């Protein structure tokens, strides 16, 4: 089997991607955060505390003929961001464009934190890092693609983000028409489960490529792209005026500024993110100080590609036995 969703930007400035998921019978569709950083598929629902949901699209399970309460189970996820949400869990049938599994943990919310709240566009997240970060207790459970693994053509899901576009998640196949040249192939720690990978250096422009082994993790979760101090210093440093501001919470530019291109090495390949996929606009309406879309991973503990480099490529995560990222440009 495969499965093929388009996947959209909540707003302006690629915050986040949402996708739309089926789940139940009949089908209740949500518009999910697909995150490769985590690995719990949960859902603003008929549990949610009343004052927490504004907007959203709730899962009922009561109105799902296939939905069965997982009983006992809990779940409690804090993410990078300072976010969270906790909940009951439900088993119940899931299918992302075409592809179903029955039988897939959905994590209902009995509360989210105000960031979620606030969020109208995200019905929930749809993890996808490995299951050993799974927080349901007592007995962990399985991602989406964990489950659908076993049925898939190949076990591989595809990430093709855009730059203020649509997008692809494919599922069990490599699509050899959405990208250019070859995909190059890194290899994956699981040890802290996620899709850790060592990138191979980095270019600020029209410079000169820094080799030098950079360990960080592909996130599809996370916004903006969070490297060592040290690069993050080098690029911004050729940008007149940009400076990192602790009021502010990062680096910040001047508006009326031409952002430079960033590079990063897998293996002997390289992938340009253009300056513009940069350029996270005015700090508050009307500003002229603009946000950086790279900032310094110092102090989150590792380093995070999040989808300021990975829109810049054809993403592939491959599950087989021993996994690897695959990056084209496109």
Same mark, same amino acid.
């Given at each position: 089997?495969?499965?093929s969703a388009?996947?959209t930007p909540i707003d ?9 998921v089926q ?6 569709? #949500? !518009? ?5 950083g $985590? ?6 629902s008929?549990?949610?505390?009343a004052?927490?949901?504004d907007?959203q699209?709730?899962y009922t ?6 939905a069965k309460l997982?009983?006992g189970?809990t779940?409690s996820?804090?993410y990078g961001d300072?976010? $969270?949400? %906790?909940?009951? *869990?439900?088993t /119940?049938?899931?299918?992302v464009?075409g592809l179903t ?5 959905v994590?209902?919310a009995?509360k *989210?934190? $105000? %960031?979620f709240?606030?969020? %109208? ?6 993890? &996808?890092?490995?299951?050993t970060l ?5 007995t962990?459970?399985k ?5 659908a693994?076993?049925s898939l053509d190949?076990?591989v899901?595809?990430?093709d #983000? ?6 692809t998640? !494919?599922f =069990?196949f ?9 995909i190059?192939?890194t290899? *994956? ?8 990978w060592?990138s191979?250096?980095?270019?600020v422009?029209?410079g000169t ?6 360990? =960080?993790?592909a996130?599809?979760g996370?916004t903006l792209?969070? &490297?060592?101090?040290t690069?993050?210093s080098?690029?911004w440093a050729?940008v ?13 530019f001047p508006?009326?500024?031409?952002l430079?291109?960033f590079?990063?090495?897998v293996g002997?390949?390289?992938i340009?993110?253009?300056?513009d996929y940069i /350029?996270?606009?005015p ?5 002229? $100080? ?7 991973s110092?102090g989150?503990?590792?380093?995070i590609?999040?989808?300021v ?13 021993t996994p690897?990222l ?5």
């Amino acid at each position: 089997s495969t499965g093929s969703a388009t996947t959209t930007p909540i707003d302006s400035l690629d915050d986040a991607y949402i996708t739309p998921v089926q789940i139940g019978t009949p089908a209740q569709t #949500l !518009n999910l955060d697909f995150d490769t950083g $985590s690995s719990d598929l949960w859902v603003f629902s008929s549990e949610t505390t009343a004052s927490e949901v504004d907007g959203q699209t709730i899962y009922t399970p009561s109105k799902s003929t296939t939905a069965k309460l997982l009983s006992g189970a809990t779940w409690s996820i804090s993410y990078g961001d300072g976010s $969270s949400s %906790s909940g009951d *869990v439900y088993t /119940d049938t899931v299918s992302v464009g075409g592809l179903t599994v029955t039988g897939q943990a959905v994590e209902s919310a009995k509360k *989210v934190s $105000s %960031s979620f709240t606030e969020d %109208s566009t995200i019905d929930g997240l749809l993890g &996808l890092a490995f299951s050993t970060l799974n927080t349901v207790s007592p007995t962990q459970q399985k991602t989406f693609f964990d489950n659908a693994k076993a049925s898939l053509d190949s076990p591989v899901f595809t990430a093709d #983000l855009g730059y203020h576009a649509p997008g692809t998640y !494919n599922f =069990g196949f490599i699509d050899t028409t959405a990208y250019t040249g070859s995909i190059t192939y890194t290899a *994956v720690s699981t040890k802290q489960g996620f899709w850790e990978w060592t990138s191979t250096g980095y270019a600020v422009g029209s410079g000169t490529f820094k080799s030098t082994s950079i360990d =960080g993790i592909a996130d599809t979760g996370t916004t903006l792209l969070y &490297l060592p101090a040290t690069v993050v210093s080098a690029y911004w440093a050729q940008v007149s005026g940009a400076k990192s501001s602790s009021s502010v919470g990062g680096y910040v530019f001047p508006c009326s500024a031409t952002l430079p291109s960033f590079t990063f090495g897998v293996g002997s390949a390289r992938i340009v993110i253009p300056g513009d996929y940069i /350029d996270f606009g005015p700090i508050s309406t009307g500003s002229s $100080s603009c946000f950086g879309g790279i900032q310094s991973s110092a102090g989150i503990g590792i380093n995070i590609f999040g989808d300021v480099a990975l829109k810049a490529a054809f993403v592939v995560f491959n599950g087989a036995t021993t996994p690897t990222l695959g990056f084209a440009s496109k």
